[PDB]
Amino acid sequence: AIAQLATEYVFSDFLLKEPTEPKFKGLRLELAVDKMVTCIAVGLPLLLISLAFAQEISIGTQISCFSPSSFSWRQAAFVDSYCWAAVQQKNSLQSESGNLPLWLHKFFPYILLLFAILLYLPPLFWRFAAAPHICSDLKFIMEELDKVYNRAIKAAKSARDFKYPIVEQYLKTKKNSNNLIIKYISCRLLTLIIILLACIYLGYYFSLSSLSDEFVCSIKSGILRNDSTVPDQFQCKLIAVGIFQLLSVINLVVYVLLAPVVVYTLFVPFRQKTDVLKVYEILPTFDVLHFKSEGYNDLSLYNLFLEENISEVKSYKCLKVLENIKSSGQGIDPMLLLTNLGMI
Template sequence: MAIASVATEYVFSDFLLKDAKEAKYKGVRLDLAVDKIVTFLAVGLPLFLISLAFAQEVSVGTQISCFPPTNFSWKQAAYVDSFCWAAVQQQADSSPFWLHKFFPYILLSLAILMCIPALIWRFTAAPHLSSDLSFIMEELDRFYNRAIKLAKNLASLDDKDANQDSQSSASELAEGCFKYLLVEQYLKTKRFTHILVVKYVVCRVLTLLILLLACLYLGYYILLASLIDEFPCDLRTGVLKNNSMVPPAIQCKMVAVGVFRLLSYINLGVYMLLSPLVVYAAFGPARQSSGFLRPYELLPGFGALGVIRPVYNDLSIYLMFLQENLSELKSFKCLQVLELLQLAGDEGFDTMCLLQTLGQVKTDVLDSRKMSTKNKEVKKPEE
């Protein structure tokens, strides 16, 4: 009997969480995996394509190649290239040649625009969400520890020596420990607030709009602007206006348009694939439920939250990010082990003693709550 008591003591001690010396939950994730993928690709891809564009410029040289007269020297030919490159946007042709000139900088603008929704979320919602998530996760771990400690104290009582008074006092102690679950009461209040969910949906809608605008621009560039890469350049300006030695027009060609067209195809294809992901993320709060907290139902007093309905409120946002940070919850891992042992029906005395004690405490708490509810219903008609 003494050996069994010592073994039970060790089992309870193993499942009891130790107090961390360092600050807890430093690595709380404030972005969902889908949002991280969208932001990484939407921002990183244009920056990568910009580097390819500038690498092409370094390897090929000038972005424009003009055909000067044969009597021009190499300095005059270089001047023609520089002059026509500067005068690209002044062409009378309706084709927007300036898009070829500023194509890398337009990609840079797209990357900056894609950062805006992530920055809005980071500076307006993430600080408040971080503090709340740390509080919720800490309370869940404390609730688990209280349940294990209570089960340990109850298991240490010898059933033969324990009288009815000690059993009733144990039930009252269990009821007192789990009567007011702070984390569940706090989460219930989030059913009636919509600040975080509005910010989340606004950021997703803004991301989708920027993606669609980028797709429109890239589609326009591919279908119209990139088809024409040659134009005439008039050199007769300034002191050369009346110089008969200078021809009225020189044919020029944009060298990098073919490369820019290929980069546009790549960027457009990736952005079109990201758009459904953004829509999927925007409907995330409507699909969220509290079913992932099912292992905590092994503990007495838990379960008053229930499975939420698919609605847009702050509670769905908290549950989404709580599910994203389950790896930070040590109590969740321990409860998963206990749940698997319970489903497997392990006959080991020590572990089953812990499970049986938790089940008994849970039953006592539920019975106490039912009795208090009945007493309230009886008192109301009498009044």
């Protein structure tokens, strides 16, 4: 049913499942824009495949050949199945557009599934090769931030009654290596390349004459060659090709809307904005240094992932509360922090 496919592929959490494992607990490991680009680019061809053969849009078989009236039921079934299998054998069928449109019309679901798989591959490579590396580091950074917050408020609490910037040094180190960022821009670049190839294929397929689904087929190989009761050629038509073209144009539109999103995603430093650690600079136990910007290096990627997963950090939440209050400038940062009383 149409509504079942709708639920399964947009309303269900299709490709939105969090990693079912206690190693990454609440950690996203895939940027929201990347998760939605993957969800679209993968589920849309699948949803379109499932629609192209919805039981109410499909009239029946995928091909019909119009055997003569003298032909029995089973002879007509043979003609249909023969021509269906004969869209490959170029000698049997004669089509005005060519044999390539026939191949594309028969194997359109396979090609869409191929595009879905190829578009799922880069997110899978990211989830397996580079997601744990960033997950461990991000979990460690969040733990260290919570610890420095607790120590700062404990020092402030003792005042109301070591000191090494380890996380800052770790991020300074991340500023050097660029392995994770080249992995990220490589998976994004393969996603963009596959999306553009899919756009090219879908634009070509939609550009077909729309009469290329009608091909002349001749069951005259083998012992049927010199047979006389069988006519020389049959007029076959590939049903559901109009549906294929109408769905291919939808896929092409969505994909050419998605390609600018991927291209923008490709520029990872430009997206690093609203410096997340700047809110921590108001802590005594934390050095006054953001030092996170301007590079095609893993530091910018970590900045993005921190900007995403930082809302889970309670210390960040309270510090941002104080920072927003500081916009008015009524009281003072350490006083409001001591008032806070939120170690964990």
